[PDB]
From a paper:
The main protease of SARS-CoV-2 (Mpro, also referred to as 3-chymotrypsin-like protease or 3CLpro) is responsible for the majority of nsp processing, cleaving at 11 conserved sites along the polyprotein including self-excision of Mpro by autolytic cleavage of its own N-terminal and C-terminal autoprocessing sites. SARS-CoV-2 Mpro is a functional homodimer of two symmetrically disposed protomers that are each 306 residues in length (33.8 kDa). The active site of Mpro features a Cys145-His41 catalytic dyad, which orchestrates nucleophilic attack at the carbonyl carbon of the invariant P1 glutamine and the formation of an acyl enzyme intermediate central to efficient peptide cleavage. Using C-terminally substituted Mpro chimeras, we have determined X-ray crystallographic structures of Mpro in complex with 10 of its 11 viral cleavage sites, bound at full occupancy intermolecularly in trans, within the active site of either the native enzyme and/or a catalytic mutant (C145A).
C6 (form 2), C10, C14, and C13WT have also crystallized in space group P21 but with a distinct unit cell, two molecules in the ASU, and a unique conformation of the donor substrate (we term here form 2 - see also below). Interestingly, the others diverge from this canonical binding, we term here form 2: in C6 (form 2), C10, and C14 (crystallized isomorphously in space group P21 with two molecules in the ASU) the substrate sequence is kinked ~ 90° at the P3 residues and tracks instead between the dynamic Met49 and Gln189 regions. This altered substrate trajectory appears to be coincident with the close contact of the donor C-terminal domain in this crystal packing. P4 residues in all substrates except C5, which interacts with Gln189 Oε1 form a hydrogen bond between main chain NH and Thr190 O. In the non-classical (form 2) poses we observe here, the P3 side chains (Thr (C7, C13), Met (C10) or Arg (C14)) instead extend toward the S4 pocket due to rotation of the P3 main chain, perhaps another reason for the restricted sequence diversity at P3. In the form 2 peptides, P5 and P6 are redirected between Met49 and Gln189, possibly due to the dramatic shift of the Gln189 side chain, reminiscent of motions observed in the C5 structure to accommodate the unique P2 phenylalanine. Primarily small beta-branched residues, threonine or valine, are observed at P3, with C8, C9 and C10 having extended side chains with significant aliphatic character (lysine, arginine or methionine).
Numbering used by the authors:
A (entry chain A), B (entry chain B): 1 to 306
Write the structure that this text describes.
Amino acid sequence: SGFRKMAFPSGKVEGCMVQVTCGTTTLNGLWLDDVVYCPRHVICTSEDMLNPNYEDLLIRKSNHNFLVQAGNVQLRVIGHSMQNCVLKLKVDTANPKTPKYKFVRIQPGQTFSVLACYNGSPSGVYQCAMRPNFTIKGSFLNGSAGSVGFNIDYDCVSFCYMHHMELPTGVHAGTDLEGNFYGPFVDRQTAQAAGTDTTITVNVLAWLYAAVINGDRWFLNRFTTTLNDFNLVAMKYNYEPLTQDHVDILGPLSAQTGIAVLDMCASLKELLQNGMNGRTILGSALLEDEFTPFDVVRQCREPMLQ
Amino acid sequence: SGFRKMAFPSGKVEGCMVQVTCGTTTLNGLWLDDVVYCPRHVICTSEDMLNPNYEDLLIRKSNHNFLVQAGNVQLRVIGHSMQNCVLKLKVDTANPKTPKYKFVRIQPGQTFSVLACYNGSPSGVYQCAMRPNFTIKGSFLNGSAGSVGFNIDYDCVSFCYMHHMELPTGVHAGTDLEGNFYGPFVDRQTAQAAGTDTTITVNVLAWLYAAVINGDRWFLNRFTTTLNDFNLVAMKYNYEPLTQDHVDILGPLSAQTGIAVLDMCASLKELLQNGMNGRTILGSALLEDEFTPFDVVRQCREPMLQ
Ligand code: NA
C-alpha cells in the first residue's frame, strides 16, 4: 500500500536526450532516429529572445551552426527546418536507442512525467499535470528548455510536452512535439496571459478513492447527491465540471471500494463546504488534484479477477 | 524556478533490475557485475514467511532452484550465498549495463530515489526520505521487494536501500545492500512496532528557504531565538532536535537569502505554535520535511560566483 506521486522510469527517454548549441545558446534536444527535435529559440541570443523574428534568424543559420552533442559524441547536422515552435535537425546518424514512440497532444487534467535536463544531461524526473489553464507547475531553471514530458504505455513512449519557458509568475509553458504551445502562450518576451486556473475535479475524486483504498476514510459521509447538484457546488469553489464521462472513468475505483461516485461527490462537497477539519488525507492538508484515475489505479488497484 | 519532489533519472538502475523466482515466490533482484542481490525471503513460500530459519531454508536450496530472468533472458545461477537479509546469486554473466556504483548506508532524514519494480520490470520512480524511525513512507505492493533506493553523483550510483516489507501500519522497511535492516525490524511475520515518527527539522528549514527563494515570504517575522529556545518549542511537537551541525549545513541557503538560520527557526516556531491560518507554503498546507538542504540547493541555488 501507500500512494506517492510517481513518474515513469525515465531510461528510454534518457537515451534520447542530446545537447543542442547554437552560438552561445545551449538547450536540450530529443534525438529520435535521424532527427533531433528542440525549441526553436536555440537560434537566439539572450537579447534575441526578447522579440525574435524566428524566420529571419533561422535563415542566417546553416547546418554547421548547430552543434549537437550526444554524450561525448558530436552529431553532424545535415538539414534543418522549423515546424511551429520547434526545430527539426536532421543528423547523419540515427539514434540506436530510439524507443518505439509517438507524439501526442495531452488534454488538460492529464499527467505526464518530466525528464528535466541541462546541457543534454538528464538531471531529474517528476510527475506533472497539465493544468486547466495549460500551464504546468514544474521545477525548471535556465537551460532546461527541450526537456520533455511523456507517458509510457505498453511498448511505446508517448511524448506529449517539450519545455520552452517560465512565465513571470513562476509556472511553466511549452509545446507538444509538433511545436504548438499548450495554452495561449508565445515564445518571446511579452505579456503571457494565463487563464485563471481551476481544480481538476475528477482527479480530486480519484485521489479520495486512493485514500479510501489506503484506509484514510474519515471524510466519508453517508450522504449522496445528484450530478447536477454537485456541479452547482463545484462551480462555487472553482472546480471543473464533472461529466458523466468522468463518472464512468471513476467506475473501477468506485467498484473496488463499494462507494458510488455520487456518494464520494457528497463527501467532496462536505469537504469543500466545511473544510478538512485540520486533518490530512494521504499525507496532504489540502485536496490534491494532480492524480488521474489511471494514476490511482496504477498504485492502488485490487482486481476482483483472481 | 519552482520546487518539486524530484527523483534521479532511473535509467542506470533500470538496466540492473532482474526477476528472481524460487518455487512460486518471485521478487526483484539487482544485477551488478556477475552478482544478483535480492531479499532472502525469495527462498520462502508465502506461508513460510513466519519463523523462517533462512539458514535452514537456504541449505535446502540449490543453484538450479533460482530462476533469474533479465527480461526474457535467463541468467544461469552458479552460486548462492546469504549476507544478513540478502541473497547473493552468482551468475555466469556480468551485467554489461553495470554502472559505476557504491553501496552506502544512509542516515535518517536523508533522501533517495526508489525505482519500484515488479517481476524484474521497473514501474515507477519516486523520491523518499528515511524517516527518523527508519521506516519509509513509500508506495509498494506485493512483489515489490528487491526494488532499490539510490542516489546518483555524476556517473556513480550509490545504492542505499533494498525493499523488503510493509509493516501492518502501511509504512515500509528494508535493508542496505549488505542486507542489514534500517531500524529494529526483522524479515519475519512477527510484531515489530516502529518508533515514534518525528519531523525532520533541518529539512523543514531547508524547505522554508526554498519557499523564500521562490517568493513565499509571509511566514517571516521579527522574532529572534537561540538554538536551545527553538529546540525547547519544537520538541513539544515531535520535531527532531536541531543541532549546530544542522545550522551549519543550512549556511549556504542562509547566505543566499540573507535570512539567518535562527531567524528562520523563529519563523518555524511561530508556524508550529499557531498553524498557517489558511495559508500555504510552496503549494502545501503542512510543513514538508522530506527535502534535504542539498535537495533545495539542487533546484533553488543562485550562486554568488559568476
Ligand atoms: Na457520501
